[PDB]
Structures are given as structure tokens and as C-alpha cells.
Design a protein around this ligand. Sequence first.
Ligand SMILES: *Sc1ccc([N+](=O)[O-])c(C(=O)O)c1
Length: 258
Amino acid sequence: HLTMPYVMPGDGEVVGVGEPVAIRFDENIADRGAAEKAIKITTNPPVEGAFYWLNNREVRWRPEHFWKPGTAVDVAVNTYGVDLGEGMFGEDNVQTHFTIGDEVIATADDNTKILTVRVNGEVVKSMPTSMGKDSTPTANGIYIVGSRYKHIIMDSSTYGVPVNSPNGYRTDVDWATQISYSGVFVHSAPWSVGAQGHTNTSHGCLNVSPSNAQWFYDHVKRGDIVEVVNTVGGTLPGIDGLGDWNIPWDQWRAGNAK
Ligand SMILES: *Sc1ccc([N+](=O)[O-])c(C(=O)O)c1
């Protein structure tokens, strides 16, 4: 009858302008109002924000617009002993303190097949890209940068197919930056450099050259933004995990505690 809260981002971290505050409990929360009342978020410079639940275990808090660089954020999760409903009580308190770094916004336009990275407003890279093919398109929308991997094996088991079976495969991938929980990454794709800037060839990921992928890995951080426009796909769900900014402010602010 105890549930532990876990808070992101990490204490002392510098994050990008799109990073939400996240509180994820290890059990489903029956009384969302009780949980929200127990979480106190302070910012400097002061800016208003609000809570929205992505599912029964995890609540997010963010402002209306992307954070101002330099903002310092204190999060007090004062859940110890709090009745979170159906006889579940908060097992402990948590806190975190973080700051916002440079504004880093990369825009991938399917009309041009270019991924343009802007750092504090300056165009710093114009990367040819190859996105998802028509049958497996990359969704449009605002994506938040998550984890980064120098090397990762992307294999067929992600789509339910065993690696050693006739249609199985496993691919060594370098410089992979996650931008959705649905499985979209910006990564090195040496095999498709000819297509990048011209044709979409992937299962949904943003293929770029080895040089550009390493640059992206080295210069982006958790909470930075990738925006995809003009693809034949739909829109990234607001509840993806890294899709929070796709929910309009009035819906987000109104919340879903009840
Ligand atoms: S989204 C994504 C990235 C890389 C690879 N890969 O196999 O190199 C895939 C895939 O085809 O499974 C998907």
C-alpha cells in the first residue's frame, strides 16, 4: 500500500527549453488531485506552468511556451504519507533542482528533406535527411530530445520479428538520439547518404550522415526540440512520452485530474 515517486529531470542537470518536469509513480494513482496538491514547483524567472497526466502513473508539468534559457527550477514532491486514494500512500518525498540551457530547435521539413539546427536563433547546421517511407512515415509534430547513445543495435525484435529467423536483422547504429518513445531517433545512416536530401527510405527514423549524426549527439541535450513538418504522416501523440508540446495550452492547463 505504498507508492514511490520518481522525478525527472535529474538533480543539478542542465536541460533544453522543451524539458517538462515529470513525476512518475511506481503504482497507478487513484486520486490525481491529491498527487498534484503535493507537488510544488518554483521557477526563477517566475513563469506559470500546469500539470497534465500522460497515463495513470505519470504527471507532467510545463509552461505554455518553451522555457527561457537560464531559468532555475525547484521541484518539491511532498508525497510522504499522502493519501493517493484506494488505500495507497506516498512512500517518500523527493526533490530536484535544474536549470535551462541554450535554446536548441531543429526543424525537419519533408518539402526540402533538410534538418536545420538553430542554436539561440543562429542556423548552425543544414543536414540532408531521409525520413520514413510513405508506408511507414515519420509523424509531424514537436518532439522532445531524450536519451543519446554512441552505439546501439536496432534489430527486428522491435517490430516482433526474431533476429535469427529468415526476415530477422540486427543493425549496428552510431550516434543515435531518441526523440519519441514510439521509437523515432536521429541517427547515423551511412547506407542512405545518397537518398538523404532527396528520398525517404526509413522505417520512421531521421537518417543523417555519420558526420552530422555525431555533431547532433555532441551538441544536443535532453529537453532540446525537434520539429517535423510537411510529412505524409499524422501528428505525434501528446501522450507519447516526448510529445507533450503537441497538446494545446488550454487543454493542458485545464488538466485531467478528474
Ligand atoms: S527507426 C530505425 C532506426 C534504425 C533501424 N535499423 O534497422 O538500422 C530501424 C529498422 O529498420 O529496424 C529503424
